[PDB]
Amino acid sequence: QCFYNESIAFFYNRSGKHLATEWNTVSKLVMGLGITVCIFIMLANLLVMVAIYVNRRFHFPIYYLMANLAAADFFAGLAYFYLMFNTGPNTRRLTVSTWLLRQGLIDTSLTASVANLLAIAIERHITVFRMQLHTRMSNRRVVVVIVVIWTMAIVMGAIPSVGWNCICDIENCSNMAPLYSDSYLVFWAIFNLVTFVVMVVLYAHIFGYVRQRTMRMSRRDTMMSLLKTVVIVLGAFIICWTPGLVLLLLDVCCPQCDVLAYEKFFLLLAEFNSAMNPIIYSYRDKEMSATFR
Amino acid sequence: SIAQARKLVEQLKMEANIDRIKVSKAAADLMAYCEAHAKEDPLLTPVPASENPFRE
Amino acid sequence: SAEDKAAVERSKMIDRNLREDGEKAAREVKLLLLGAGESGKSTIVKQMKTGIVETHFTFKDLHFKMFDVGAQRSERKKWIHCFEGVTAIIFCVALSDYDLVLEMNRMHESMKLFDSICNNKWFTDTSIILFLNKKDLFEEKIKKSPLTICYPEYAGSNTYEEAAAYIQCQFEDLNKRKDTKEIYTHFTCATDTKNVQFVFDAVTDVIIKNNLKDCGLF
Amino acid sequence: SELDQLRQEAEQLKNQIRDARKACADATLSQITNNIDPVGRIQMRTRRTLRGHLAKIYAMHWGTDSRLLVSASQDGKLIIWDSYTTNKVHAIPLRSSWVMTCAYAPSGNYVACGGLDNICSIYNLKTREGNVRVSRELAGHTGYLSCCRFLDDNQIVTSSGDTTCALWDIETGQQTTTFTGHTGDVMSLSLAPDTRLFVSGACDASAKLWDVREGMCRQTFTGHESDINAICFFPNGNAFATGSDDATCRLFDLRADQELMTYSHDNIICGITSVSFSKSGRLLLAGYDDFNCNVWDALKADRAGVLAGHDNRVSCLGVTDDGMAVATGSWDSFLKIWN
Ligand SMILES: CCCCCCCC/C=C/CCCCCCCC(=O)OC[C@@H](O)COP(=O)(O)O
């Protein structure tokens, strides 16, 4: 019934997206910005990974999760680099399978990054709320959560690649992803919002518990540092994802909305999220900065 | 601390009257004993892992 | 292999018993009790509850162990490292000895011991709970003799409120790892029987801060 | 007046002993050993690692069977392994979790431990009807127990930080003999093959040779500039070696009565924890605080191997009576066997 034999031109014409026939000024601008952001992401995350693997001190679950996040950010940078040199005029020569792969790469990379953030939050909550003195973990749960993260990311990336595509639901197709369906966009946005809510709740509970159990001995304030760290961690995610996340909602709910205007800058910001992640989770640790040299 | 001093002198007294031997003779005897038992030292001559009880 | 598997079974039983013992032990606090020759450490032991004495107790569903090694009378540089990893070091000092002598003042010897302990290369990240005993005795004594005998640089009224704070700041200043560790001071109250509550609060704060430090929160 | 003249006579006697030692020093072992060829690089690999301890390891000891060995840890357990099959045979729970020494009887019937409690606990492994129970608890020392070696099934030599050593009697429980003369904490001791003599090293930068039968000091050796943490006998019985915190080992000879050889490397500055000799005496293994153990050459005084597989300080090191392997235990809670 549905059209697997058609070309990308038909899918892009059914929507309002346009195909560029040459390198426009905006095309070169976004290409340069993306190349710079990609090289920065790769360099920073490779440095983080090598620093974590080299030193013997960084052999604990939190550092393992940080290294997994760094690897996910490196993968996101590679995916965004591949996206570049395949956008603009190059996208006019892409086929269905290649387009699906190019988008699934970004999808799974960003999903893995978000899941790593959530896992870091959960591990911090566990480590803080373990009223028991040490109760050292067997160190096997970290690998379990890592493999679960990667499996969930691979699933979220491959589902739209095989089966959950608007190829056979042509009328119910998006505008920024003419091949994908709006249902997948809604699902991804709900997942992102739920992860953010869970992170905020966990960090707020941590802050409240710490304040309650430290006020007695209060009288380098711990409250100020903890609040600053939580606020930064949450505000990065907010400023990076909210403007891009609301765009999918505008596309699915508001027809005639000029969603195609700021999609590229919003994706650049979502990638800047991973570019800035290694700094947020690695600047406070003085030993981490000391190991750098 | 006179008692301590007398005890220390009495102790040092017996140290001097010992059958001391020249360093050359002691070194020669040490080298002789060390090279005579060299065949029986596994650490010295690595033994094949087949016979070593700990290797395999 | 008629019995070789019984050896493996016994090894597994021993291993699970060791795991259970480790689990039971990991939920016990370690407080190394230190002090000079003469202080109220015995009074502290009595209030809370040949070579080494171990006192175990429990407060608000939290267990505590306290070790006293004042009867060693040997070179401290050799066995001190054995106490690396303890949750805290409860140091004791009697204020009344500010004017007494050992030859030399006892307070100066206590300060030397505190400097040697706090700045040791094994106790860099271990916090110290300082106790200043003989509160009423010092309050009654200071009226006769001034604190200038021990600390000549002191410039203040011969009153308990001021002299006690002066001694507290002098003892806290000796700390050099001002960022890795924290010092908790509390003047022992005999009537209140609140010395266990302060220890509990301090240990809770220390545990929470160490937990935060384990992760990137602090 | 008497104290002054006694001190002067003591100093004159020390000078006379120095002159006698110099006269006996006709040459140096380095020159006599220059002709013989080097042994070559000695490479050893970790053949088996043992797990089970949840805290630092402070001491271990091999048995005469060359199969079972005892190890202690701060966690309060005393474990008996099986190097051939890394099978835990016994795990005795200690009354005090502060232990700094171990020992395995020559007959394999008893073991010993001790430390800050100042009590030497002797455990019997018979287990006629139930779990291993404390056979005896020797008390009387006024300091921490640093080392203890089973002289026999009824006798045992102990050393403490009270600047003295003791020879006990398990059946009686009283100090059969006492050895005094040291000025600092005795950190280690080593028994001779015949059990007729032993040597003790203290923090006074000196070592002393004691006769068990008589009870006096035979010789006193000096030359170090710091505390002696370990001491081992030469298989022959006429020499020994001492390791100190000054990053230097020294091999002394009894009959020569002076410093025979010195082992020091500019690249090494950390302290030394344990020393041992091979079955032939060629190799002088020494564990350091740098997390490694450096093999030496008793005759040539040149490094011939480095063992580095521990993540923390190497606390204890031992060589089997057969010489087929070497055991090492560190503060990382893991034991390892080499060769
Ligand atoms: C608009 C960005 C909002 C943030 C979304 C981060 C992506 C996470 C995955 C979401 C699943 C649905 C994403 C659908 C929008 C993806 C748009 C995109 O990433 O393509 C870039 C676009 O220029 C391509 O232009 P051409 O090369 O000229 O076709």
PDB file of C-alpha atoms and ligand atoms in Angstrom, chain A residues 12 17-19 83 86-88 91 99 102-103 106-107 110 176-177 180 184-185 188 241 244-245 247-248 262-264 266-267 270, ligand 1:
ATOM      1  CA  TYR A  12      10.008  16.871   1.335  1.00  0.00           C
ATOM      2  CA  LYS A  17      10.678  21.754   3.715  1.00  0.00           C
ATOM      3  CA  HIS A  18      12.804  22.918   0.787  1.00  0.00           C
ATOM      4  CA  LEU A  19      15.843  21.364  -0.890  1.00  0.00           C
ATOM      5  CA  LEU A  83      24.950  14.881   9.625  1.00  0.00           C
ATOM      6  CA  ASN A  86      25.100  15.272   4.344  1.00  0.00           C
ATOM      7  CA  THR A  87      22.750  18.255   4.825  1.00  0.00           C
ATOM      8  CA  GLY A  88      21.909  21.087   2.466  1.00  0.00           C
ATOM      9  CA  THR A  91      20.569  15.789   1.403  1.00  0.00           C
ATOM     10  CA  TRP A  99      18.053   9.337   5.871  1.00  0.00           C
ATOM     11  CA  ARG A 102      21.231   9.559   9.793  1.00  0.00           C
ATOM     12  CA  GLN A 103      18.291  10.536  11.996  1.00  0.00           C
ATOM     13  CA  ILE A 106      21.115  11.505  16.471  1.00  0.00           C
ATOM     14  CA  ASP A 107      18.037  10.080  18.187  1.00  0.00           C
ATOM     15  CA  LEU A 110      20.723  12.113  22.546  1.00  0.00           C
ATOM     16  CA  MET A 176      10.824  18.761  10.249  1.00  0.00           C
ATOM     17  CA  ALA A 177      11.076  14.958   9.887  1.00  0.00           C
ATOM     18  CA  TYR A 180       8.853  10.213  10.876  1.00  0.00           C
ATOM     19  CA  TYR A 184       7.123   9.243  17.810  1.00  0.00           C
ATOM     20  CA  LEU A 185       7.821  12.937  18.403  1.00  0.00           C
ATOM     21  CA  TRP A 188      10.210  11.288  22.696  1.00  0.00           C
ATOM     22  CA  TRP A 241      16.203  21.319  25.500  1.00  0.00           C
ATOM     23  CA  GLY A 244      13.864  22.514  21.017  1.00  0.00           C
ATOM     24  CA  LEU A 245      11.404  20.310  22.890  1.00  0.00           C
ATOM     25  CA  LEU A 247       9.153  22.803  18.755  1.00  0.00           C
ATOM     26  CA  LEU A 248       7.939  19.221  18.328  1.00  0.00           C
ATOM     27  CA  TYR A 262      14.652  27.651  14.043  1.00  0.00           C
ATOM     28  CA  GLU A 263      15.015  23.858  13.821  1.00  0.00           C
ATOM     29  CA  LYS A 264      18.720  24.007  12.970  1.00  0.00           C
ATOM     30  CA  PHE A 266      17.654  24.354  18.201  1.00  0.00           C
ATOM     31  CA  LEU A 267      19.489  21.186  17.164  1.00  0.00           C
ATOM     32  CA  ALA A 270      20.700  20.413  21.875  1.00  0.00           C
TER      33      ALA A 270
HETATM   34  C1  LIG E   1      14.485  20.699  16.105  1.00  0.00           C
HETATM   35  C2  LIG E   1      15.491  20.186  17.131  1.00  0.00           C
HETATM   36  C3  LIG E   1      14.791  19.970  18.473  1.00  0.00           C
HETATM   37  C4  LIG E   1      15.651  19.084  19.371  1.00  0.00           C
HETATM   38  C5  LIG E   1      15.481  17.630  18.940  1.00  0.00           C
HETATM   39  C6  LIG E   1      16.749  16.832  19.230  1.00  0.00           C
HETATM   40  C7  LIG E   1      16.684  15.519  18.454  1.00  0.00           C
HETATM   41  C8  LIG E   1      16.239  14.375  19.361  1.00  0.00           C
HETATM   42  C9  LIG E   1      15.391  13.440  18.509  1.00  0.00           C
HETATM   43  C10 LIG E   1      14.132  13.756  18.315  1.00  0.00           C
HETATM   44  C11 LIG E   1      13.219  12.884  17.465  1.00  0.00           C
HETATM   45  C12 LIG E   1      12.472  13.793  16.492  1.00  0.00           C
HETATM   46  C13 LIG E   1      13.428  14.813  15.873  1.00  0.00           C
HETATM   47  C14 LIG E   1      12.770  15.433  14.646  1.00  0.00           C
HETATM   48  C15 LIG E   1      13.509  16.714  14.267  1.00  0.00           C
HETATM   49  C16 LIG E   1      14.927  16.378  13.813  1.00  0.00           C
HETATM   50  C17 LIG E   1      15.408  17.452  12.844  1.00  0.00           C
HETATM   51  C18 LIG E   1      16.850  17.167  12.436  1.00  0.00           C
HETATM   52  O1  LIG E   1      17.639  16.819  13.247  1.00  0.00           O
HETATM   53  O2  LIG E   1      17.242  17.331  11.104  1.00  0.00           O
HETATM   54  C19 LIG E   1      18.007  18.478  10.883  1.00  0.00           C
HETATM   55  C20 LIG E   1      17.474  19.218   9.660  1.00  0.00           C
HETATM   56  O3  LIG E   1      17.978  20.524   9.647  1.00  0.00           O
HETATM   57  C21 LIG E   1      17.908  18.491   8.389  1.00  0.00           C
HETATM   58  O4  LIG E   1      17.907  19.379   7.310  1.00  0.00           O
HETATM   59  P1  LIG E   1      18.291  18.780   5.825  1.00  0.00           P
HETATM   60  O5  LIG E   1      19.623  18.073   5.897  1.00  0.00           O
HETATM   61  O6  LIG E   1      18.371  19.916   4.833  1.00  0.00           O
HETATM   62  O7  LIG E   1      17.224  17.805   5.392  1.00  0.00           O
END
